[PDB]
Every structure is written in C-alpha cells, then in structure tokens.
Amino acid sequence: TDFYTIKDAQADLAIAPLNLTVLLAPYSTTPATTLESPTDGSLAIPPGYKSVGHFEKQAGLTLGNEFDSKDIEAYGEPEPIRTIINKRTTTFDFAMYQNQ
Amino acid sequence: TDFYTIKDAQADLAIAPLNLTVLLAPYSTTPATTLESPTDGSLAIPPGYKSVGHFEKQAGLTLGNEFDSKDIEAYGEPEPIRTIINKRTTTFDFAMYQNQRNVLELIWTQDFSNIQPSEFGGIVLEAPKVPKNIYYRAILVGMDDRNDRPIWLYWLMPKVKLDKLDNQTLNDDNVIEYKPTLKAFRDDVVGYSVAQGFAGPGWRDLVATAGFGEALTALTITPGSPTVTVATGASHTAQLLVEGDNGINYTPDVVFTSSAPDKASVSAAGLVTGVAAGSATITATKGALTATATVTVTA
Amino acid sequence: TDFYTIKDAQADLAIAPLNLTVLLAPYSTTPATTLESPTDGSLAIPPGYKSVGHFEKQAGLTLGNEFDSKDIEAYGEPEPIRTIINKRTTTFDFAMYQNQRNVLELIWTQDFSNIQPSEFGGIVLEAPKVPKNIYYRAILVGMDDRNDRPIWLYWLMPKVKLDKLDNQTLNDDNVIEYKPTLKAFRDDVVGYSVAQGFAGPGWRDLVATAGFGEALTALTITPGSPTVTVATGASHTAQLLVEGDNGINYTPDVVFTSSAPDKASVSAAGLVTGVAAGSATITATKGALTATATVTVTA
Amino acid sequence: AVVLPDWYEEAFVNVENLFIDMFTDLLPDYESGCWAPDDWLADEIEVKPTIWFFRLPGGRVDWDGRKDECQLQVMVVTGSRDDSWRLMDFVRAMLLPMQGDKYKMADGYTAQIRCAGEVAGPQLLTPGQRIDTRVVTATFKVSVSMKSAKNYKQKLYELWQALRG
Amino acid sequence: AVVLPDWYEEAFVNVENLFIDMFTDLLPDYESGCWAPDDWLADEIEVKPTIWFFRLPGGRVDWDGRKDECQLQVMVVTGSRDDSWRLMDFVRAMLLPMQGDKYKMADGYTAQIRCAGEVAGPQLLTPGQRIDTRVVTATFKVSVSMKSAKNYKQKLYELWQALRG
Amino acid sequence: AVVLPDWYEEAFVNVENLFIDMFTDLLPDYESGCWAPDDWLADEIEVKPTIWFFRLPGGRVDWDGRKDECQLQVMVVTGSRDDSWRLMDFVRAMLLPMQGDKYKMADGYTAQIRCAGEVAGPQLLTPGQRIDTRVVTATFKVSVSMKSAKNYKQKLYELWQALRG
C-alpha cells in the first residue's frame, strides 16, 4: 500500500465563505428552518431577515465556542469517570460599518 | 577514551512523522491493539477507523501532557518524601479542514447518521440540546521513510473525547478550520489511555539499536536440510525463513545467494522451487552478519 | 596600586560544557561518588549509566533552582531575624531526540524491559494505569578542553525523577522531541541531592588558582636515590612520582630531563629503566617551578 | 504547444488573463493585455489608450486553503495625464470593492476574486523613449480561489513505481 | 572525478537532481536540467520547452532533525507565454501539495519531500538576448529529509590522533 | 615578519588555518587554502579540485565567554558540477554535526569547534572568466573556543606608567 491513501484528503471539502453576510430578524418572525428553496433548490432567505450591511473585511466574524466541563470524580480514579459538559455557548462578533 | 563516545548519539533514531493522520472510529468498534499486519508486517489499520482528512500543516498536532503532583510531606523534611502523581491527562488538538460527516459529528458532539439530504442535496445540522458524551477511538499515524523502508510511528488512544474548541475566524483568505482538543481517557478493556508504537522495515533496522530485545548477533534459517521434488508435486517448492536470535523474522531484509543454482535456485525471497535433483548450499547474505544453509533436491 | 588588580579576574576559570551529556541509570546501581579514575585520573563513568542520547543544541539543559525563604519575625524588627531556607529543589530539562528504550521508559514512567518485539520488529508501549514512581541516577557531564588537556565538569544527582513534560508539536519540519523536567531528590545513602565536580588535567592546572587546597609552591620526587639493575632483574625499572605540596600527583604534567642519559635515562613518564650502571641527576622540568632528584644505577 | 499529461487538469486560474478579459468586456475599444504589442508601438504621437496587467512576486499561495495570492501591477497608458488618471480611477473602482465576486472568463470558467487590496498607490511615471505617452502604474494584491485543490500524488507514485520500482 | 574517503557515504540528497528526474519522468519529451545546454541554445526561433531547477541560498539545514531545507528556483522556458504559464501551473500543482511524499530517483534512492512551499510567485521575466523565448520563474522552499544523519567524528579523531597525536 | 612583544601569546585560533589543515588531512591530494594560488590558476581545461575557506564578517566574539564566532565561506571548485556538489556534500557532512569537537592543527595546538551551523545554503555560481570550473559556495557560522582569555592589562599599564607616567 501507499501512505497517502490512508489520509484520504479530498482537498475540495474546504469551503471558505468568501462573502459572509449577517441577516438579523425580529423575534416575531418565523425562524428559518433551511435556506434551500423547496421548488428550485436555490438560496431563498425568508422575508423579515434584514442584512446588517458590510462589516470589516480583515476582522470578520469570530464564531466563538465555550465549554463548561464538570468531570465528576466520586471515589478517586487515575482518570475521571463520566466527564460531562454543562453549557455550550456560541458567540460571534463583527465590526459593522453601516449606520442603518 | 574520547568524549564523543560517551554521548553515543545514534542520530538515526530521531523519527519525524512526516504525514500525520488522525483516524477516528465509533466506540462500537474493536480498539486497535497494533498497526502491524500479522501475516506481512505491514501497515494494516483495522476497519471502522475513518480519517478526519487533512489539517493545517504549520500547526500540526500539539500532543499535550499534564501531571498532578502531590508531594506528601508527613513530619517536615528538607525534601518531600514519596512524591506521587495523581492524574496524567493526554490531550491533542488539530485544525481540521474537511467538511466531512465525521468531522462535523465530532465538532457538534452528535450522530448525523440519520441526517438525510434533501432532494436538492441540502443538509442542516442542528446542535444538540445538551452536548452529548460521545467517545471515539483515535489513531495518530505518522510515517518516516529511510530510503524505501518506512517507519510507522503511531499512537493508540482508545477512548478520546472532545474537551474544548477554538474560536473560528471567518475571513475571505482562509477556509473554515475546526480545532478540537481531544482528551484521551483510559479504556477499561484494553487498560491503557495511550500507547506509542513503531513498525516497519526501518524499525526492523533500528530496533536493535533502540535497545528493545537482545542485540543482533546470530542468524539462522529454520530448515536445516530441506528436500524438494523436481516434479511439480506437493513438495516442489519450499520457503526459507531466516530469523535472528532477536526473534525477528529477517527474511524480507536478507537476500540469499546460491553457490550452485543448477541444483537449487533460491532468490531474495527464499524460494526453494529448485531446478535439478541435487544439493546446493544457500548463503543468506546480509551486512555485518551472515548465515549459511544447505538445500537438497530430490524428485 | 591599580584598580584592575582589585577585581583579580582570572578569565580562564570560566569553564563551558561544550558537549553536555545526560546519563541515566536504574535505582539498583551504585551511585557515582566521582568521575575520576583512581588509577589514571581519567574520565571513568561507572557501569550501568546509559546516555539518553543527543538533545536539542540551541535549548540545552536549564538547571533550575528554587528557594523557600521563611523570614521568621518574632516581635517586630526593621529587618527579619534568622531568615531560613526550607527547601532547595534542583530541576533540569532537556529535549531528547533519540527514540531509545530508556528515553521512552523515562517518558512513560514504566519499565519496558519485558517488551518483546514482534516477529516483524514491531513494539507497542502502553502507558501505565497509574504513573509509576521511578527514580533514576543522573550525571550531566561536560568537557571543556584547554589545548589538549580537558576539564570534565559534571553534576551528580543520584535520585532524580520526572516531574513534568512539555507539549509536543508534531510537524513535518521537526522531529519528535521529549522534554522532561527531572527533579533531583536527596538520596539517604550518599546524603546529597546534587554534587558539582571538576576533573581532568585542565583542572589540575586550574585547581590552585581556583582556591582549593594549598598553593603550588614546591615539588618533590618520592624516591630520594633509587637503585636499578642493569640486568633484566626485578629491580630493572622504577617509577618516578613527582608530587607537589598541594598533594596532587604532577607526574603526567612534568617532563623530566636527565643530565647524564648514558647512566640513567628518564623519559617524560619518569621511566627508570636505565642504561648503564651509574648515578645520573634527574631534574623534573616544569614552568615557574622546578624540582631536582638523583637516581643511581647498579646491576 | 505543451503536451501536458492526459490525467492533469488546470488548478490555478490566470490572474492576468482574467483581468484582461474583464477589462476587454468593460472597455471594448481600448485594448488591454499582458504585453506591448508590436502594432500598438507603431503609433506614438496619437497613441491609443491601453491597460497592462503584470503578475508580480507577492503573497503566499495556500494550496490547502484553495487560495492563490499574487501581486498585480496595472499600467495605464494614454496620450494625456488626465486620461491616464481617469482610467486608473476606473480600474481602482473596479478592483478595490471586490469581495467574493465571480467572473466568467473567455474560457467559460467562472473565477472568484476573494479580495483585491492596493500595495503601492498610483503614480505618474517619468517618460522614457516614448515621450508622448503618460503612464500611471499601481500594484494590487489580488487573491483568487483555485480551480481545484485536487492533488496528483497517485499518478506521481505510479510513475516511479512503474519505471524504477 | 573526486576521490572521497572510502568510509564516507552520501548524507544529503541532490534536490536539483531529484526534481530533474521527477520532471523528466512527468514530462518525457521536454528536457529539464540544472543548466542551459549548448545544443538547446542552438535553436531559438523554434525553441523547445525546457525547465531549469536552481538551488538557491535559503532555509536553515537541521542536521539533528534530519532535514535539509533549500530554496529552489524553477525557470520555465517555452516559445509562448501561454505555454510557459501552463507549464508553470503544472509545476506548481506538482510541488505545492507535497507532504511527506516519496520519490525514487534515477540513482535508485527513494527520497522524501517533507514540504514544498512557495516564496516568490511566478512571473514572466522581460526578454533578454533570446527575444523569442518567454520565461516564467518562481522560487519554492523545499525541505527534504537527509539520507543519513550519521556523523564521522570517529574518523576525524583517528585522523588527527594518527597524523599528529 | 611581525615582531610582536615578547610577553604576548596568541589568544585566537585561525579558523581558516584550522579548516585548511582539517581538509588537507581529510582530502590529501586535493589542495585547500584561503587563496587562489598562481600555479593552480595555470590550468583551466583540466582543473584540479580545490576548496577555499574565507573568514567573513559575522557572529559576535565573546571574550568573557572564551568564544570566537565567525562566518566561514567555503568555495568548492571542481571541473564538474556533480563533483562540486559531491565535495560540498562531504564538507557539509563534516562541518554540520560538529559539537565541542577537538582537532589538532599542524601547529600542534588542539582547537575545539563549539558549533557549526549553515547561514547560506550551497549554490552553484554562474561562471566568470574561468569558464570550465563549476564552483559551489556555502557560508557556515563557526564558533571556536579561544586559546586563552588572559588579558594583558598589566603590560598596558606598565607601558604608559613608564613612558608617560
């Protein structure tokens, strides 16, 4: 065998979002289940989502993730037993330019 | 004496994993005891381990180690007595690039097996209400090649789990990168949390120098005086298995030369097919060491 | 006077360990009291100490020190009274490159002596269930050479143990580096936790200047008037041992010249084999100091 | 021309070709290219406007990131300084606000300009032998996504495992 | 040639030779080398395509790490700019995705390219005396593992302890 | 030659002399030096191999640390590029793994090379007037311990306290 086959690097599954857009909507609207048009298979953003305009190119969104790990140890073991996660908070920030 | 001998720097035991690969597997699979093929001594990853694809070259994997030191002092001493270690946690992280099902399953701590794409090939991956506790069996395979003889240096962590995940910057000049920090737990079946391993013909060369097993001093071929038939019978062919006192089968490494190929012809693979009814001496040709044997032919 | 004399900077007592080597030994061996051969005054590492091979050149060992100061103040003073030190811990770390048995044993805190390679030279090194408490005897030998006379500067820590381990980055441009931080404990047999030492002809030159022992002022040769036989008898040859008031044997350093080589010939090694029956004057030739002796020959 | 292997397909777009096509579509009459044509140099007193795009060493390619970064130098040549500055302004307004923009070249392939920043600003270069032409030059840093990051390690291994091995 | 000591074995691979062999296997008809051959310079109006590899001062060798890093400059010479850019694209698509790849040279030794990044991007150089040849040049940072990190300190010590000592 | 004061002894080793002696011991027939001899320049068509060592401005001396750092340039001149690359490989394999290695020069003094790293990698330089010689040059950063860090402040003070004082 040859070693490069083990990795099996597709190299075409690395999708880079080249024009990232943020569309905020009021809490009264129906949340979007998907952005695929049922009849055409095309991008169909539901009404009520209004873009916040252009933001800083070099900064971009920083989609953050935080984990609350609580590795419960009952009677003492060299490794924790049933390491659970309490909370997972997702945050993202962007430097908006538009004065909308 | 001279001082450079004291260090005794081999300088060839520094194996660098040049193509590191990570192979996650579901917890239902059987953990891999070793990555060596029993019948051939080659790389054989067991089925069920799927690669997570390519990750960032410049960052690589940061195989971290943490020690919990509890130096118990009883009645007051200038130095601690019986300094023990409580916990040793092994963690490793990598910046994946592939948007595969297993990668996203690991990131979101969910099972996306039942996620059926829409009629237009569209999928949505909802995050779980509570982050699930999903365990994986991971292997970190790396290959360093000496000439054409590779060294497969690998780790066997059988109960890894995601611990943290770095923030993702979504610009136009970089692709989305997932950087989870997997933490290796101690599986109660295999009894270990991590196991470094080496394999390959390069390791067959370097194992004696590395200090594992007895030193290579003698070489023997198991059939003392085999007999093969000129006719195409059952005993037409035979196999030569040169094996040193180290217990390592050196047959692929050792090339055999026959003084009288007319009677018995033996190639570098130790083929004992033979040519004519007679007795031929076979000399196992190696480097600093050599082995000798005699092969007879009789129809 | 002039001010430069007050400092009295030797500038030659700055010994740099140019080839630092770390030698680890099991706890069952006898710790090394010194690295000086009693019979020859040469570097003699005791058996059982095996080097950990080459490590990173640019980083090297970082022999750290920690002090626990407890300035006891009883009733209030502008400065503390009887400031004491609780613990002095000596630690040193190095980035090993060799994938030897002892290196991996130290990293994994296990004994891989029973690890038998497979028939194809494949080994797997499982991590222990609980990190074992394994002690080692360590020597850190460095050699600085003046002309052709070396100075063997070394440390003697007899009860080291692995404390922590640095995270490992597995890229393609660098080999795997193991960077343990050994901590030196106090052995109850030898009574010390660390012992710096100096040895070699260079230190024979520099010891009087360093300030150890009496100053080099006079030299003497122990046989006042030896007699050797012209014939090949038992007393055919004798030995000259020039020794200063410092108590250090200066025989290899001092070259002896014979005024009358026809009667007795003495080489740079103080050989008293002789030529003809007679009395010859042997003058131990050194630099600022000189010694004189007389040797007689009679069959 | 060049007989490349049959199994090989193009992986990088031609930035110079892409912008030549873009500015021949934007400005049809004015000729843009990567070179000074022999017939364009024939007339100097009444010189026709032209735009030149030159790929320059700059930026780091990211094969894993499917990004091909390069420094592009745009040389606007007209018969008047005002015309050269107007054309350079047009080029800057076309290139600078690009962010993930798609463009279908003459080859029928739709490229994608990730970003286009300016490294060195415009400047009116001193005249050379061609004395009646005013040239305004600027350098842009153009990042464009590759056609495909597919590697041909399999063919490379087959080559030396069939010839030598 | 050069009579090296009997106890010395080669420790570094020839990066130029390795890539010359690789691109003579990949491109059989098109000639690649480390030099401009005298017979290749004979024809200029109808010039045959060629590729030149030049080792340049760049990167730091790591003897302890068994790594030999160097900067490799690739000069693609064809009779047309489009052909030169196509061939340079082929070369970039070959070298760039390499990571621990192995290749058996004509010497029978299987090398191992650790990585191959790009320092200076491709560019079409201005013509010189050879006016009909379009050359595209690029520099790559190539790291390849050494044949053996074994040192010969013992032989040097024997030499100076037998001659002088 | 030069009449130095009677109380002065050498404090630094000659790095060029040390390596010239080392590579005349390693390669007896091939001549090495710090200069191009007049008789060596006499033949070009059949040129004998040679190695040139030049000390260059580089590295900081550390008198207090008993260290003498310098940049050494090695020029391998042979009649063939393959021979030059082989000899440069030999030189690199000798110099690079050095770490606290002692060597007894022709003067009878045993030096000690602290370390030897490569600053600029090997490269084949374009031919000059001598057209049939292929030269491969590479610079190394060589650190060697001093003979003695002893200072002569006593003599310096005595001088001006006897003459002027």
Whether residue E104 contacts residue E54, with contact meaning beta carbons closer than 8 Å, is answered with no
Question: If residue B182 lies in a helix (H) or strand (E), which one and from where to where?
Answer: strand B180-185
Q: How far is CA C273 from the centre of its chain?
A: 34
- CB-CB: which of C4, C11, C148 is closest to F149? C11
| C234: phi then psi, degrees, rounded to nearest 5 | -65, -40
A79–chain C nearest CA distance, Å: 9
The span from the CA of E135 to the CA of E157, in Å, is 50
Gap between the Cα atoms of F62 and B269, Å rounded: 60
Helix (H) or strand (E) holding B68: strand B61-71
The answer to whether D84 contacts chain A (CB < 8 Å) is no
Query: CA-CA distance, E102 to E17, in Å (whole number)?
Result: 14
Sign of CA dihedral C44, C47, C48, C52: positive
Residue B231 buriedness (CB in 10 A; 0-12 / 13-18 / 19+): exposed
> What's the Rg (C-alpha) of chain E?
19
Write out the H or E segment, with its range, that includes residue B4.
helix B4-7
Which of 2-61 (A) contact E at CB < 8 A? 3-4, 11
Side-chain half-sphere exposure of A69, counting CA atoms within 13 A: 17
Exp. method: cryo-EM
**Six token digits for residue B105:** 């399953």
Cα angle value D90/D95/D97 (rounded, 5°) = 105
User: Within 10 Å of residue C46's Cβ, how many Cβ atoms?
Assistant: 16
Question: What is the C-alpha separation between B224 and A36, in angstroms, rounded?
Answer: 74
End-to-end Cα spacing for chain D: 31
- Spatial neighbors of E63 by CB under 8 A, at least 6 apart, are E146, E149, F96, F97
What is residue E157's three-state secondary structure? helix
* Cα maximum dimension of chain E: 66
Residues with Cβ < 8 Å from C8, sequence gap 6 or more?
A: none
Q: Using CB atoms, which chains have 3+ pairs under 8 A with A?
A: B, C, D, E
Calculate how close chain A gets to C129, using CA atoms only, in Å: 7
Q: Give the gyration radius of chain D's Cα atoms.
A: 19
Q: What tokens appear for E39 in the block?
A: 């017979």
Pairing of strands F134-145, F110-124: antiparallel
Take residue D102 and report the two structure tokens written for it.
Answer: 């798609």
3-state SS, residue C78: coil
Sequence-ordered alpha helix ranges (H) in chain C:
4-7, 101-108, 201-210
Calpha distance C19→F101 (Å, rounded): 8
Q: Rounded to a whole number, what is the distance in Å from the CA of E115 to chain B's nearest CA?
A: 9
* Cβ-contact E132, E79 below 8 angstroms: yes
Beta bridge partners of B106: none
Taking Cα atoms as reference points, which of F98, F112, F110 lies closest to residue F66?
F112
User: Are chains F and A in contact at 3+ CB pairs closer than 8 Å?
Assistant: no
Interatomic CA distance for residues B156 and B162, integer angstroms: 16
Integer Cα distance of F91 and F77 in angstroms: 12
Q: Which of B18, B171, B174 is nearest to B95 (CA)?
A: B174
Contacts of A3 in chain E (CB under 8 A): 100
- Picking from B97, B164, B171, the nearest residue to A67 by CB comes out as B164
Does chain F reach chain D with at least 3 CB pairs under 8 Å?
no
E positions 44-63 inside 8 Å of F (CB)? 54-61, 63
Residue C181: Cβ within 10 Å count: 16
Farthest CA pair distance, chain C: 85
Q: What is the DSSP string of C56-76?
A: -TTT----EEEEEEEE--SS-
φ/ψ of residue C196, rounded to 5:
-75, 145
Residue from D61, D64, D115 to probe the interface with B (highest B Cβ count within 10 Å): D64
Q: Tokens in use for D69? A: 């970064």
Rg (C-alpha) for chain B, rounded Å, is 27
Residue (of E144, E142, E86) closest to E117 by Cα position: E142
Question: What DSSP element (H or E) covers E154?
Answer: helix E153-163
Query: With an 8 Å Cβ cutoff, are B99 and A64 in contact?
Result: no
Strand partners, C280: C295
Element (H, E) at E23: helix E15-26
| CA of C18 vs chain F CAs: smallest distance (Å) | 5
- Of C185, C169, C187, whose CA–CA distance to C177 is shortest? C169
Give B45's contacts (C-beta < 8 A, 6+ positions apart): A6, B23, B32, B35, B139, B141
Contacts of C252 (CB under 8 A, 6+ apart): C41, C201, C269
Q: What are the strands, taking DSSP E only, across chain F?
A: 31-33, 50-56, 67-78, 99-104, 110-124, 134-145
Chains E and C touch (3+ CB pairs under 8 A): yes
Contacts of residue C292, Cβ cutoff 8 Å, sequence gap at least 6 = C281, C282, C283, C284
Helices (H), E48-152: 81-95
DSSP assignment, residue F42?
A: G
- For B81, name the nearest residue in chain C, comparing CA atoms only: C185
Give bridge partners of residue E33 from the DSSP assignment: E52
- Residue B26: closest CA among B46, B12, B40: B46
Paired sense of beta strands B227-228 and B290-297, if any: parallel
Q: Which of residues 139-168 of B touch D (CB under 8 A)?
A: 148
Quick count: other Cβ atoms within 10 Å of Cβ E144? 25
Question: Residue E66 in 3-state DSSP?
Answer: coil
According to DSSP, the β-strands at C83-93 and C180-184 are: antiparallel
**C82: region left, alpha or beta (phi > 0 left; psi from -120 to 50 alpha):** left
Using a CB-CB cut-off of 8 Å, the residues of chain A touching D149 are 11-12, 14
H or E element in which residue B296 lies = strand B290-297
CB nearest A14 (choices: D66, D151, D154): D66
Handedness of CA C97, C101, C106, C107 (dihedral sign): positive
CA pair distance C12, C18, nearest whole angstrom:
15
Return the number of other C-beta atoms located less than 10 Å from residue E116's C-beta: 21
Please tell me the distance from the alpha carbon of residue B71 to that of residue C86, in angstroms, as a whole number: 15
Cα R_g (chain F), whole angstroms? 19
Sequence-distant (≥ 6) Cβ neighbours of residue C48 within 8 angstroms? C25, C26, C29, C30
List Cβ neighbours of F55 (8 Å cut-off, separation of 6 or more).
F15, F16, F34, F70, F71, F72, F73
For residue E127, give both structure tokens.
Answer: 């013509």
Resolution, given in Å to one decimal, reads 3.7
Please count the residue pairs, one from chain A and one from chain B, whose beta carbons lie less than 8 angstroms apart: 118
CA distances from C189 to A42, B263, F115 (A): 81, 69, 39
Distance CA E27, CA D10 (A): 16
Cross-chain Cβ contact F97/E63 below 8 Å:
yes
Contact at 8 Å (CB) between E114 and B60?
no
**Cβ pair D114:B173 closer than 8 A:** yes
Distances (CA, A) of D120 to D136, D137, F69: 12, 9, 41
Phi then psi for B257, rounded to 5 degrees? -115, 135
Helix axes E81-95, E15-26, angle to 10 degrees: 120
- Long-range contacts, C32-37 (Cβ 8 Å, 24+): C32/C137, C32/C139, C32/C156, C32/C158, C33/C156, C33/C190, C34/C156, C34/C197, C34/C199, C35/C139, C35/C141, C35/C152, C35/C154, C35/C156, C35/C197, C35/C199, C36/C199
HSE-CB at B180 with a 13 A cutoff on CA atoms is: 21
Alpha carbon distance C35, C50 (integer Å): 15
Contacts of C82 (CB under 8 A, 6+ apart): C72
Q: Which two tokens stand for residue C58?
A: 């640019």
Task: Please report, as a single letter, which amino acid is at residue E160.
Answer: W
C266 close to C295: Cβ distance less than 8 angstroms: yes
Instruction: Tell me whether F100 touches chain B (CB under 8 Å).
Output: yes
Joined tokens for residue C146: 């003046």
Report which of D6, D159, D152 is spatially closest to residue E25, judged by C-alpha positions. Answer: D159
